[PDB]
């Protein structure tokens, strides 16, 4: 079994030549003759082709290692890639399960707590608790809440409120999407979750579902994996069937890169893969 | 007759009379049942002294009670106006006869 | 109205109805008084569900109880036939509202 | 002045003394010994004494008797430093005091617990609890129970029962008083308590009370200080006024000691000092 990045780094750090070659490559990539020689040595090490896993121990460290030696732009490869009111029903199933009820209430109470009149909540703490809910409660509970189908506005508003968007999603400023992307790519976790969403929800013109390998589950997981970061996506409104999800951003102020900004945003707003995966989940496919 | 212990009931939070206009459900746990242990010598003494009117006319409990020894941390729900609420210690977690 | 706590009474052991023919006295301590804390949401919930006939018609205590949390270890005395007796946990030592 | 436990610490630290005391300890029991004894009998260790209810009382007494070795005196010197019915009333005062109630109940429950049809009680444990009562409850409580005055048999029977004699005093065999003395003198505590009783309760023909220095309190303390040992004394019966106390022994089988045995027993049974002290306590003046 190939080794993950945390372990590969232990092995490299224990031998002075590898460690020095690694330090050199890291320095080269944070920007010749030595750089090329450093790359060549590391290609024979287990750092080359090392990967990470969602819910692993030291996920962040793994990702820091992965990106420190990654050679690179619109779509980055994922570090995780190996080589009747239905929303009310969903909330009931969650509250009747001890683990779901606890972790649900925990993010609700953290995200709903006002810090001051100019601070709706502790956003960082809120995001962290949302990550805990999606990582530690099975998807049979969490996806049923996030992706439930709706026929009226009260159901759709309940769905829109799942992540408590007033704290976790909305902000005083709505940045430009490419600026937000920029901010997301400076954080190791967000960057990786974005790249994993790009890999699993990228629309295909070849498959019946428009999803890669017709794999709805992997797309839904990667979508949910972005909740709790800079690029947290949500239902933009409480329309029942006219579902639009997006990060908290717009293509205003794009200038020369309006085309690229819009292309970026469309992977959320106008993506037949994501659309179809969300709809199939709610319908019982 | 079932002895003192934890019972479970699915309730609509709006039924509870606590001011929450919500159609959400919670698992309400409570303590109920008979305390079946042998009568304490303390209680037998106290029942005798009470009958004999040796007490100073006051509320005295001369029998054990089935009551919670611990409570649920928190439960949350969304109401009809799209407002979230968190309630602390709504349900019993453990019971005992004291 | 005095709140829940320890009360004291000098009693002749033969007054207690526990079968000891003795003229000795003991300091009998017990728990009495009112539990004055604000009502719990648990109890308010439980009172409503009881009124609404939702609790399977069982014995339920929906109010705190003033009861001992600990008991005297032992007390001894000699009876009229010159026999010694020791009684365990005859008196309360500490009280709480539960 | 300095007690024997402290006197021994000061000896154990100094070169010549500690050497002589290690010699004496190895000799006991066990010319070079006689020399070690002499030096120590001329050191200040020979003047050390003990106190009732001190910390490490037994150690103190072991030290004292290791150097206070001409032999077999009738009266040995004390190692201790010099200084409705009323019985029902005394039991009430004791049961209404938390400390007395506890320590009373503690000996009663131990002394009253049958072990088997052949063992009335754990006598060792009973004795120990009786000592705790007399050592850790003030004499204002304990003496009022032990020395209360009586006018009828119910009062006298209660007084007789204070020590729960069925366990602590009575035994299948009644030994000869000199044999009992012999056994008592092999135990450090008993031996010392007997010597203390002899020093404080021995009748005098020179004083108005017949007690030494007219000191009733010192006699009563020393009398009570023998309860819980081999020589435990008690009221021999439930006569209200005709008070007679004795250890559990007789002068049968004395032979040529009938004179010595009877003299020993009379210090309890026919002692105007002890008689007067017990009667004056009960009278309240």
From Swiss-Prot, chains B, C:
Disulfide bonds: 4-66, 31-95, 35-97
Residues holding heparan sulfate group: 50, 59, 61, 63
Record localization: Secreted
Highest taxon above the source species: Eukaryota
Family assignment from sequence similarity: Belongs to the TGF-beta family. GDNF subfamily.
Linked pathology: Genetic variations in NRTN may contribute to Hirschsprung disease, in association with mutations of RET gene, and possibly mutations in other loci. Hirschsprung disease is a disorder of neural crest development is characterized by the absence of intramural ganglion cells in the hindgut, often resulting in intestinal obstruction.
Function: Growth factor that supports the survival of sympathetic neurons in culture. May regulate the development and maintenance of the CNS. Involved in the development of the neural crest. Might control the size of non-neuronal cell population such as haemopoietic cells. Acts by binding to its coreceptor, GFRA2, leading to autophosphorylation and activation of the RET receptor. Heparan sulfate-binding is required for signaling.
Quaternary assembly: Homodimer; disulfide-linked. Interacts with GFRA2 coreceptor and RET: forms a 2:2:2 ternary complex composed of NRTN ligand, GFRA2 and RET receptor. Also forms a 4:4:4 tetrameric complex composed of 4 copies of NRTN ligand, GFRA2 and RET receptor, which prevents endocytosis of RET.
Name this protein carries in UniProt: Neurturin
Organism: Homo sapiens (Human)
Gene name for this UniProt entry: NRTN
Shown stretch of the complete protein: 100 to 197 of 197
UniProtKB/Swiss-Prot annotation, chain D:
GO cellular component: external side of plasma membrane; extrinsic component of membrane; plasma membrane; receptor complex
Molecular function via GO: glial cell-derived neurotrophic factor receptor activity; heparan sulfate binding
Top-rank lineage group of the source organism: Eukaryota
Membrane topology according to the record: Lipid-anchor; GPI-anchor
Residues bearing attached sugar chains per UniProt: 16, 283
Disulfide bonds: 4-48, 50-60, 87-148, 94-100, 111-126, 121-167, 150-155, 177-249, 184-190, 201-219, 211-273
Localization of this protein: Cell membrane
Key words, A-Z: Cell membrane, Disulfide bond, Glycoprotein, GPI-anchor, Lipoprotein, Membrane, Receptor, Signal
Location, primary (coarse class): membrane
GO annotation terms (biological process): cell surface receptor protein tyrosine kinase signaling pathway; glial cell-derived neurotrophic factor receptor signaling pathway; nervous system development
Subunit details: Interacts with NRTN ligand and RET: forms a 2:2:2 ternary complex composed of NRTN ligand, GFRA2 and RET receptor. Also forms a 4:4:4 tetrameric complex composed of 4 copies of NRTN ligand, GFRA2 and RET receptor, which prevents endocytosis of RET. Interacts with SORL1.
Record function comment: Receptor for neurturin (NRTN), a growth factor that supports the survival of sympathetic neurons. NRTN-binding leads to autophosphorylation and activation of the RET receptor. Also able to mediate GDNF signaling through the RET tyrosine kinase receptor.
Name this polypeptide is given: GDNF family receptor alpha-2
Residue range from the parent sequence: 37 to 359 of 464
């Amino acid at each position: 079994p190939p080794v993950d990045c945390v372990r590969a780094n232990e092995l490299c750090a224990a031998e002075s030549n590898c460690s020095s070659r690694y330090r050199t490559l890291r320095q080269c990539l944070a920007g010749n003759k030595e750089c090329q020689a450093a790359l060549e040595v590391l290609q024979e090490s287990p750092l080359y082709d090392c990967r990470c896993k969602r819910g692993m121990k030291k996920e962040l460290q793994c990702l820091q290692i992965y990106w420190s030696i990654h050679l690179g732009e619109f779509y980055e490869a994922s570090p995780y890639e190996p080589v009747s009111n239905h929303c009310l029903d969903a909330a009931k199933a969650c509250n009747l399960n001890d683990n779901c009820k606890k972790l649900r209430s925990s993010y609700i109470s953290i995200c709903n707590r006002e810090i001051s009149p100019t601070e709706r909540c502790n956003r960082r703490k809120c995001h962290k608790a949302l990550r805990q809910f999606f990582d530690r409660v099975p998807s049979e509970y969490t996806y049923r809440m996030l992706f439930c189908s709706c026929q009226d506005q009260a159901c759709a508003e309940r769905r829109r409120q799942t992540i408590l968007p007033s704290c976790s999603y909305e902000d005083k400023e709505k940045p430009n999407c490419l600026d937000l992307r920029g901010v997301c790519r400076t954080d190791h976790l967000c960057r990786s979750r974005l790249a994993d969403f790009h890999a699993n929800c990228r629309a295909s013109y070849q498959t019946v579902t428009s999803c890669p390998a017709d794999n709805y589950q992997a797309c839904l997981g990667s979508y949910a994996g972005m909740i709790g970061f800079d690029m947290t996506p949500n239902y933009v409104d409480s329309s029942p069937t006219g579902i639009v999800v997006s990060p908290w951003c717009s293509c205003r102020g794009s200038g020369n890169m309006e085309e690229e900004c819009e292309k970026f945003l469309r992977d959320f707003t106008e993506n037949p893969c994501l659309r179809n995966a969300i709809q199939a989940f709610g319908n019982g496919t | 007759a079932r002895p003192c212990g934890l019972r479970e009931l699915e309730v609509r939070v709006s039924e509870l009379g606590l001011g929450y206009a919500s159609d959400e459900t919670v698992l309400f746990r409570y303590c109920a049942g008979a305390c079946e242990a042998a009568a304490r010598v303390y209680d037998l003494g106290l029942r005798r002294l009470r009958q004999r009117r040796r007490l100073r006319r006051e509320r005295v409990r001369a029998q054990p009670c089935c009551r919670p020894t611990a409570y649920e941390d928190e439960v949350s729900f969304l109401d009809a106006h799209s407002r979230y609420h968190t309630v602390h210690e709504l349900s019993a977690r453990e019971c005992a006869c004291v």
